[PDB]
Amino acid sequence: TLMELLNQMDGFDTLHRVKMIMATNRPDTLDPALLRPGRLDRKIHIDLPNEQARLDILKIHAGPITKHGEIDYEAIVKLSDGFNGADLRNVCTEAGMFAIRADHDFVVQEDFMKAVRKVADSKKLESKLDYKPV
Amino acid sequence: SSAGFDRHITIFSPEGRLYQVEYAFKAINQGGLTSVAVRGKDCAVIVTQKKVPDKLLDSSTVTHLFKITENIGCVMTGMTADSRSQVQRARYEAANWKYKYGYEIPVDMLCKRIADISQVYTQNAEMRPLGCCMILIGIDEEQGPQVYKCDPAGYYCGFKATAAGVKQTESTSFLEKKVKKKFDWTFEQTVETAITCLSTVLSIDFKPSEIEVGVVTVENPKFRILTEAEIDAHLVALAE
Amino acid sequence: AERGYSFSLTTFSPSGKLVQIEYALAAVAGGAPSVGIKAANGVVLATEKKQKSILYDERSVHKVEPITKHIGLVYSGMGPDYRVLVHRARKLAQQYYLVYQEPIPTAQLVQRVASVMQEYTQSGGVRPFGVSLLICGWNEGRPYLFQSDPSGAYFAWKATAMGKNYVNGKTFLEKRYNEDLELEDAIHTAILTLKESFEGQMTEDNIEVGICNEAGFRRLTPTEVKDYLAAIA
Amino acid sequence: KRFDSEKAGDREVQRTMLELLNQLDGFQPNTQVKVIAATNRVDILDPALLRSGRLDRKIEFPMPNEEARARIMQIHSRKMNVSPDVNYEELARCTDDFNGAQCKAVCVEAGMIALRRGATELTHEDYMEGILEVQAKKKANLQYYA
Amino acid sequence: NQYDNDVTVWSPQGRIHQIEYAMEAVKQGSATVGLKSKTHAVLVALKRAQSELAAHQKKILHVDNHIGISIAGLTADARLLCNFMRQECLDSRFVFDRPLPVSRLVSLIGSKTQIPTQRYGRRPYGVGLLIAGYDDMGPHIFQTCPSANYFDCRAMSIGARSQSARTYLERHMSEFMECNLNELVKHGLRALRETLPAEQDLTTKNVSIGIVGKDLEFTIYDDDDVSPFLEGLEERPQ
Amino acid sequence: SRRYDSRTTIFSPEGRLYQVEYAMEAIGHAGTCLGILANDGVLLAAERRNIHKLLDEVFFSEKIYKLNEDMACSVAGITSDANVLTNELRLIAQRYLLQYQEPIPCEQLVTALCDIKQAYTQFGGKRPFGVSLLYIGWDKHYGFQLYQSDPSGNYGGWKATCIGNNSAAAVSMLKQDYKEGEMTLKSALALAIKVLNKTMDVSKLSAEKVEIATLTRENGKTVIRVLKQKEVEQLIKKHEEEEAKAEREK
Amino acid sequence: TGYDLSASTFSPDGRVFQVEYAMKAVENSSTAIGIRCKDGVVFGVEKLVLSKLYEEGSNKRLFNVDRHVGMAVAGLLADARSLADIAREEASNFRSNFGYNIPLKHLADRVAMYVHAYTLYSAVRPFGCSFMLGSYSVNDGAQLYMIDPSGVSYGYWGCAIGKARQAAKTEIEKLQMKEMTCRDIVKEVAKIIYIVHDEVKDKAFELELSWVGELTNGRHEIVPKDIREEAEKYAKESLK
Amino acid sequence: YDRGVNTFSPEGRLFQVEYAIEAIKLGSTAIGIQTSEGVCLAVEKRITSPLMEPSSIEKIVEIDAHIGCAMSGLIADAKTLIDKARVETQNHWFTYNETMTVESVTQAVSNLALQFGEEDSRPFGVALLFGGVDEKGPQLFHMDPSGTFVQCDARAIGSASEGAQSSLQEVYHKSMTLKEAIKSSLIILKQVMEEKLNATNIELATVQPGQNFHMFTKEELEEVIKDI
Amino acid sequence: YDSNSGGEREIQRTMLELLNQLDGFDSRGDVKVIMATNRIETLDPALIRPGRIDRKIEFPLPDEKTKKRIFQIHTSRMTLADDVTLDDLIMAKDDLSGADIKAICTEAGLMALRERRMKVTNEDFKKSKENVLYKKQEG
Ligand SMILES: Nc1ncnc2c1ncn2[C@@H]1O[C@H](COP(=O)(O)OP(=O)(O)OP(=O)(O)O)[C@@H](O)[C@H]1O
């Protein structure tokens, strides 16, 4: 199957108008064929969310959620380091999914930092083998 | 290619490689720190930072800038448990130099002696190689300031500007262009570059309280640690 | 005493070969090229030291570490294991100079050092050195050139080489270097053969040239190093 | 996902799993019909399993407490005829590295020798007997300990 | 299964199996129940033998005048530590001309067994010592384990199926502090009598009892010396 | 720490010595040395391992070591490995001459070294010595003696020798050329050159690849003759003349 | 496979599992935290109840090593007692060769060096004890150090150990380390300890407390519970 | 799973000691008897071939003047303990001007029971039967390689010791006279041996407070042979 | 292993199933099985109890009398010269099996084919013997 991809992108053909995007866990298996330009011209690795970007992604998940008038996001940014942008949202949702036990409609961020700190740190215990090659 | 106990002990691979020291090389990444060493004409600047996960952290106890000699400071990387063990032996060897030879140590020979002991850790397979990274400075008579580094390969090293560790690979290539050209180095020049190499890698631009900036200059040769108040002055000086 | 295990880690292969020592020979081949030439008046050694980044300064670390005023030396392989036996031989020549009050012979250094080194291969619980020494010096008017190995054997060559492509370089030194020539020629063909496997950049800091005159060893400064080779070879 | 290619025999199942996770990625409707997963050991775990639609709630399940080991076996033997003399504390303290299912094995062991006993009703001492029976292992002999 | 080889290796769960395997040796020893009151202390042990002709092996042995001890498990390391135990007695008895309070005494024992629980090539010590003694504040009862943890108690028990004895303890040990020596003795052996099978004695020679007091020096009681203690007791029911 | 040792000291359940078997296999390779029975003298020769003409050859006798004025040795194996043993036995000989002021006889000499080597075999897991080296010399009592060292700790002393495994054909040659009381050391020298002229793989018998060290008995100097290749070449051509004369029969 | 056996042996991930297993070994112990006020240092220990088990006041984890320093330990009790002897003997060396109170810093450093040293050889094992170190003095002040089985020497105003850790130090931000005197810190800590550590896992338990500072005149001792009886008074009424 | 040879078993106990008890099964059997008049002890020499010299192997040697002993399993293994114990009791006689008791030999050997290890090597698997006459009269003691001592009236070792204790307690009683015990030993011996009874197959070790030493002498056994 | 197959432990499991096949449960049929190898120490003792528990033989090295017999049996069909003696031949040889003394005779007859002679002389026999003698002694 490679040979079809490889020969059609080493053509003998104009792919200029068409566009292609490739994704993987690691660029270990891609061979010198796909790591070569042509087929794969550019490479953009994802990086861990910066704390400045972490504040942003936090902001977009606080919108639909209902909170108390007293809110401080920086507490979460400082307490949450190295997490994945998905894992941040899972933590926000877990903060809300912890409020249903308290049955309260409006939820303060104190209860949030409770669920955040505890559960997120549990994610760190399950974070083994997260280191991935370049 | 691996055969026998060579993964568990210190020997030569079928290709001649050593597995333990290459593991200790990446042992620094578990510390998650960064250290940059820049030397000027009359000066040398050392910049680092620290992590403050809890508001209960004391800035004084967790400071990563260690002072071996009144005129010679140092810094470390990776885990601190291993660095501390090397601290007291650095100091001990400084004092024995001062006792035996009656004069201050060039610091050139300090990293060499230390690196010999590091060879012993590399040789014996029944003891831990101690993969902490040693970074030093020094002052020599009419030789200007000096910057040394030591890695747990059992060897000594020292250059103009050298930065080794987790993210230091990218800071290096950034420094190589700033050094030359023809660019000369003064005091405020080096101080102002210390943050540029950190920003290009990080670009966090945060409170100066987390970062520690060491310097060694020949005015009063005594090593001095910079206060946050003056550090912030340089930080607002570089941003116009 | 460590606990004092001291069990030899090198078994004898079914063919009689040594395991760890041949692997250490692989570390010698993976090291850096270093040539030497014994001709006429004295011995000339040529090492190579290249920096991995432009931030490096070679005025600090020296590859040529003379053990005596009239006895120099270079190496190939890993450096850490080199420094060890350096300080060793320094303490080792001093008993000779203390008992006899006479400069120790180059051939004596080899025997003493390689005996301790061979014992270092037989000593239990520790790996041999991965460094092949090239020893020189002038004694009794006739200078000398020796070459050591991790197993501890010692040879005598007019012109030899270690490091990568040392078998290719050796055929070059055989044909291109012969009989006996002055120290100037000794420098010349040394730098030519070193420029064989060297990169397309040759500076005073890329290599160093050590020389043993019958007047004694003198380590040349990078100034003269770039003066002879500029205009390399 | 092993490490080095090629290849993994499960690799088609890793692609299928990563296609499942991809289903929870590129497609929103997978937010319906919950799916539960369970592993005997987390030694090998795909890092990609961390998400709200992927694995989220995570609990490490240790050995049951003594209080638990007492009650679970009582809920297991509640159908069986038992003499109304038990300590309950005894067995609970006497259980280390034991499992709740081992407790079921102990309740059956109690009835296994009850056949040769002839007693139509289970007794207290039968329990501890069965405990020491299957655990821990066997056998050798009681000597050298005076 | 290969990580249980050494004493130095930490299990993936952090539990070193060498100590646990020694605890099994403690459980294979005879059931012995020690107890103390606010005034006098009574220790009880059980004698066992392999053949009928063989004399039952004694457990409780006298060290200090006010310090008796029981034993279970390996007798090798037991008598080794017993030589150490004698040493520490006569030590302060010579230098300070006074005995040692057991509190500070067993700390020395735990530090003694700390080294062989850590250094490679060394093994732990299987131990069933239950130590009793009188300082100025009265009696003390401790316990010994290969883990080198000593716990101050009023009563403790080790050996085969010795937990069932504890079950009799909890309710009785609170009310046995006021009683005098007499009933305290038989209350000691009442815990063992439920450890052994109920269809047989429990003779005079298969059992060891000792009594120690503030004003009463410790004397080893065995055989006919147990006859005054066993007499006047009620047999176990069916 | 017990799992790291390969147990080089303990035996092999087959009855053989595991380390020692591989040890002897090293002597089978590398070094090659010969020995023969000669009257009023003794002869030794070896094949140089580095036949490359770029060497300096400043070491004089290389594969032939002289441990004493009355005795010498022919080494086969790793050079430095021997070089521990040469200075060792050299000190033992010199402390005999120190204590008794008498030349050490070959017997107890050799056996002393052999027990030293045996020590490394029965304890310590140490690397035994895989160097089997020869022995020559003269004593007042027994006169000329020939001995041989073995890794196993037994001395392999005979009147002839096989070093290394390439010389096992020289032993079969020596059983056909066996002689008792005939020297003419030059006859035994043309014999030993006849050995390498056939059994050795290298042909033409290059005089620079071998070294012949003879020791003739002299009172009381015990002259040690180290010969140059110039007079060996004419001797080799005399041997080849003997070969050319032997083919003249048929 | 076998990489986790010897602590001196590295792992393909560039660390040592023996330290790692030793860490959670201390986590399974009962919760023992620490906190320091301005004029002193507060210690606390929670003692579990399994069966009875024995007499109250036995094998408490609160040990007194020095005049002004004490040991609040967690994890395996034996190793803690042995290390308490080690700190005792070290403090004795200081008092012998100098004759004044050993500063907290170099004390915990001397211990930390041993903690790290028993992890550089295959003979001995990493320690399974983590303990709190704190002291107060008039020419010193209030310092609290936290020592971990890896051998890292640092310290905060408060720290938490045992099965309840993150949840144990969560409410610490609510408490004022500075304004609140030590007299009040006692009850402030005890009430949360009574509320934390849920009784479903352990039905019964017992709580120990210790303090040193200016009120005791530098003398470190376990605060007498018959005195003031602070905990149960406010802790039994703090459940609502 | 060979662990430091000193390491506990999972069950458990000392590996090498547990294994060393099995070496008693392969050794010769010996049956001692304690009598009020004295202590009699017998063994089977187990003669393999007529090449064997009768007086070359003796399973019973007297450690102290009034205290004997009997070994088990391997011979040279006990040699080391034998000759050293006699020195122990001797020095006791020097310091206290009085001989060592039968019970004292027990702790004497128990202190040296297990000295094996590596730092700071194999435990002996020879069991010991201590005979002798202390201040309380004729006594017979038994000890094991693990170091556990126990006082036995009539104890057997070796291979058939399990079967020998069997027929032992059947015929054993406390009113045993010494002359009766003597001929009671040989009854079991002749059942457990393959060779015919002769003066070279077995030996009798007897000791009494009023008859000593004794030890034993030749031709005395020859009269016991015809007593069957 | 040959070609691409794995692995060391799967190899063992096919051998173990060979034992249960051979043990065995439940077959009384024969198919008598004989096993042979050079080194018995490699095979696991797990294989011996099912078979062969009754009989295993060891092959000793031949002595002077045996080697004399061996030469007799091979040279029975061959024609040799009168001067060939059987004493010196077996004396010069040390630890040789039947096929070795066989191969030296085969090469003696092969060399005798160069002269086209059916009777092998002792000089030709010894010169041929030296070829295999040099063969084993060359490397
Ligand atoms: N006593 C004897 N009499 C006659 N012939 C014998 C005697 N001993 C051995 N032989 C012959 O010598 C031969 C020895 O065979 P050899 O051991 O050389 O085979 P091989 O090539 O090693 O076989 P494989 O390679 O399968 O092990 C046998 O074929 C046998 O016929």
Side-chain angles (χ1 to χ4, degrees), chain G residues 146-163:
Chain G
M146 174 41 183
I147 287 83
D148 55 345
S150 53
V152 180
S153 182
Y154 61 99
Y156 311 132
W157 272 281
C159 185
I161 327 169
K163 305 178 289 300

Side-chain angles (χ1 to χ4, degrees), chain E residues 1-7 18 21-22 24-25 28 49-58 73-77 79-80 83 119-126, chain H residues 2-4 6-14 103 106-107 110-111 113-114 116-120 146-155 165 168-169 172:
Chain E
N1 51 28
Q2 68 279 356
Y3 57 97
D4 301 337
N5 192 281
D6 277 8
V7 197
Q18 301 302 329
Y21 298 150
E24 302 297 325
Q28 291 285 336
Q50 183 62 254
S51 59
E52 296 90 352
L53 56 97
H56 302 155
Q57 175 51 57
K58 65 175 182 298
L74 291 174
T75 63
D77 299 334
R79 292 165 294 191
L80 187 139
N83 294 279
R119 295 190 187 167
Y120 172 89
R122 307 282 308 264
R123 62 175 193 283
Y125 290 162
Chain H
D2 291 352
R3 38 185 77 179
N6 192 31
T7 315
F8 292 157
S9 193
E11 285 83 359
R13 64 189 58 90
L14 292 170
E103 190 175 358
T106 294
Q107 284 77 14
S110 310
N111 290 321
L114 303 181
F116 69 102
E118 283 72 8
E119 61 288 359
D120 302 343
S146 65
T148 298
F149 161 66
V150 55
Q151 172 175 356
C152 291
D153 297 338
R155 189 56 173 180
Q165 300 292 95
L168 195 148
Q169 293 120 7
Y172 176 70

Side-chain angles (χ1 to χ4, degrees), chain A residues 110 113-114 117-118 121-122, chain G residues 165-167 169-170 173-174:
Chain A
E110 202 271 341
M113 299 186 291
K114 291 297 293 180
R117 190 158 167 274
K118 298 287 302 173
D121 292 339
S122 307
Chain G
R165 181 163 171 178
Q166 310 183 337
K169 51 187 180 180
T170 298
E173 56 184 352
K174 297 307 167 188

Side-chain angles (χ1 to χ4, degrees), chain I residues 37-38 59-60 62 66-67 69-71 73-74 96-102:
Chain I
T37 190
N38 286 333
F59 177 85
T66 311
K67 297 181 170 171
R69 183 47 175 179
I70 292 179
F71 190 77
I73 305 183
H74 299 53
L96 272 74
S97 80
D100 257 324
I101 203 164
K102 175 182 288 311

Side-chain angles (χ1 to χ4, degrees), chain I residues 19-75:
Chain I
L19 184 67
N20 173 36
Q21 160 172 198
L22 188 140
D23 197 346
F25 181 77
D26 54 340
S27 176
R28 200 187 58 89
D30 61 330
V31 69
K32 293 288 285 176
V33 181
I34 307 178
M35 301 168 66
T37 190
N38 286 333
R39 185 192 313 272
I40 202 61
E41 298 292 326
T42 42
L43 304 175
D44 289 340
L47 309 178
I48 298 161
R49 297 310 294 267
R52 192 49 177 106
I53 179 50
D54 208 37
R55 188 49 174 170
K56 63 171 315 183
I57 44 81
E58 182 267 352
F59 177 85
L61 59 94
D63 42 24
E64 53 173 9
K65 307 181 285 310
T66 311
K67 297 181 170 171
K68 194 176 176 173
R69 183 47 175 179
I70 292 179
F71 190 77
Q72 199 53 64
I73 305 183
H74 299 53
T75 59

